[PDB]
């Protein structure tokens with residue numbers, strides 16, 4: 001009579017922790033959602049095969065409006081698992097689902113998995129130096145989101161790095177590329193003119209973290225804006241002031257222009 | 266010819282990912298370090314038994330000073346693994362180790378695992394709202410470090426949460442407790458008087474993240490400073506102003522006083 005929130009990790013079915021797998025294998029019912037992120041290296045069947053169970057996939061509406069009608073009822077007489085990409089409680093509104101479980105008299109446990117939030121460490125940028133995070137959302141109709149531009153500004157101002165999650169329209173199979181994010185940001189700079197994001201801004205692109213060969217690229221917007229970083233998902237990072245070793249890693253591992261080695265302390 | 270940076274995850278031997286375990290099992294040599302952090306819910310013996318390989322433990326000096334003489338030589342003609350608690354490359358100086366590998370003509374791949382940077386999402390605090398992170402260090406002799414106090418100040422000022430890592434002396438196996446961290450901060454506040462950390466400050470304590478039964482507590486310093494949060498490791502967080510949903514989580518899941526619903530929102 002329990003509910004397990006189990007993260008599946010970054011790229012494929014093997015990114016789940018051993019703990020998550022052994023527990024998932026023994027659950028009576030297994031649900032999952034794949035709209036909060038993209039696991040570009042696996043498939044549902046591959047996942048079902050590994051866990052050895054049938055997985056009922058839920059839409060954003062099933063979860064947000066009917067979690068307590070579809071999932072919680074079964075958790076009262078059985079052990080239920082709710083699988084999600086990355087870590088189940090990161091950059092999502094899933095934490096509130098634990099409140100729903102509590103109110104329905106269901107105990108819940110959380111099994112973590114690798115998250116893009118810590119995976120950014122592979123960019124060479126010190127993780128403690130990351131400031132507030134944000135999401136670049138697709139404009140819709142006459143609505144053009146821009147708050148993420150202010151986040152970058154506020155962080156950069158403090159010498160902190162900015163992690164930018166990119167938009168996703170799962171039902172439309174749409175995954176915002178770093179290129180599209182850069183285009184949108186230049187447009188916002190054009191509007192606000194704060195000098196926050198321009199053709200000369202240094203950025204870092206991390207694509208398909210979790211795979212053995214992710215694409216890690218660093219450089220000026222003017223040079224990367226049209227570069228092909230491979231299939232999604234992508235995340236964009238706008239570094240703040242760099243430490244010598246961060247610059248060195250970006251140049252040696254991410255192919256950044258050797259000129260960034262010369263930091264303006 | 267290949268070096269694998271493999272994370273062991275948060276708490277015990279089952280926190281490594283399926284991908285990480287399988288890769289580690291195919292490596293000719295396996296190294297590990299436990300000075301950046303320790304796996305409090307397991308032992309080297311249990312990790313060794315699970316991986317089915319003997320594990321050579323390296324000290325901080327072994328890694329920082331001689332990584333290229335101890336680990337890289339073997340990586341030239343064998344598959345080598347380097348295990349670390351949490352997610353690889355999160356520890357500040359680890360990213361640079363990949364540069365050493367490149368310089369030695371050794372290929373390196375990163376296998377991610379759960380990190381406290383993302384696991385703190387279990388506190389119900391929105392991940393995007395976290396600002397710069399810091400480590401609370403013990404004062405020693407004539408040295409009284411307080412930069413972590415300024416980090417909290419700058420974050421809270423902008424409505425951001427502050428993740429605080431607590432001092433650890435791996436070799437001596439001694440952990441700074443959340444209780445001690447609070448005492449130090451109150452002491453730092455008495456000196457700087459910036460109105461950053463007082464008896465009325467709301468804090469969150471996370472202990473044994475990764476275990477199936479972690480300790481998650483939220484409340485004011487005056488009530489938690491002498492509370493028993495259990496065995497280490499402990500993580501201290503000083504939230505900025507809360508979203509009502511964050512406050513509700515803290516009350517319903519972390520036993521926070523209902524008072525935060527009006528005071529810290």
Ligand SMILES: Nc1ncnc2c1ncn2[C@@H]1O[C@H](CSCC[C@H](N)C(=O)O)[C@@H](O)[C@H]1O
Pocket residue numbers: 010011036037038085086087088089090091092114115116117164165166167168206207208209210233234235383
């Ligand atoms: N493997 C990966 N590589 C690059 N970006 C990724 C990624 N996985 C997730 N993301 C980024 O994060 C967004 C989803 S946000 C949800 C994050 C998830 N709970 C976690 O713990 O990672 C995506 O739209 C994308 O921009």
